[PDB]
Ligand binder design. Structure first.
Ligand code: BP4
Length: 185
């Protein structure tokens, strides 16, 4: 791909984070803590899952960023509407305002309803995310495999401002403690 020149500097929004997440001083890394991180509750925080939003809001244009997923067993990445549900149980789907892919139990899937199997020969250590607001496209790229395409959501109906979306996943196994990191431009 040739999307690198639309690179944007994403930072994480602490106020949206699940109360167990630990966000680095530079707001570029996030990991699951082993306990509540001693913050007050608020209506923005994701309650049920280890999720957090980027601070940036996009309503036009082309945007690109990269995320490091090295040695994680489980995670979700993509974009979502600014007005997605924060509290209780929900599925990641375009109907609910999410355009995402994930790793879970050694398989990669796109967050359609129902979910779509992804075909990845080279397990990615870094994922590139491209959004074309006007075209209604969200695309995912395998940076470890020379930028190969993972998945394209097309005919997207965003229906609002978009925010970068992250889930570091649970760590029931003891093998999923590693952080998500926003990679430098
Ligand atoms: O509205 C809901 O679906 C659940 C809900 C509502 C309010 C708060 C809340 C907690 C502490 C300070 C402010 C607001 C948390 C969850």
């Amino acid at each position: 791909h040739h999307h690198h020149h639309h690179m944007v500097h994403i930072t994480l929004d602490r106020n949206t984070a699940n109360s167990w997440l630990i966000i680095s001083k530079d707001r570029r890394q996030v990991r699951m803590g082993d306990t509540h991180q001693n913050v007050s509750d608020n209506k923005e925080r994701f309650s049920n899952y280890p999720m957090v939003l980027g601070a940036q809001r996009f309503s036009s244009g082309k945007m690109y960023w990269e995320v490091d997923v090295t040695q994680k067993e489980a995670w979700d990445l993509g974009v979502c509407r600014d007005s997605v549900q924060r509290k209780g149980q929900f599925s990641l789907s375009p109907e609910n305002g999410f355009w995402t892919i994930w790793l879970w139990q050694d398989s990669y899937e796109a967050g359609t309803s129902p979910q779509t199997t992804l075909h990845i020969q080279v397990p990615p250590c870094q994922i590139g995310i491209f959004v074309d607001y006007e075209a209604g496209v969200v695309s995912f790229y395998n940076i470890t495999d020379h930028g190969s395409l993972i998945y394209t959501f097309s005919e997207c109906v965003f229906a609002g401002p978009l925010r970068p979306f992250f889930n570091v996943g649970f760590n029931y196994s003891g093998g999923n403690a590693a952080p998500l990191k926003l990679c430098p431009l």
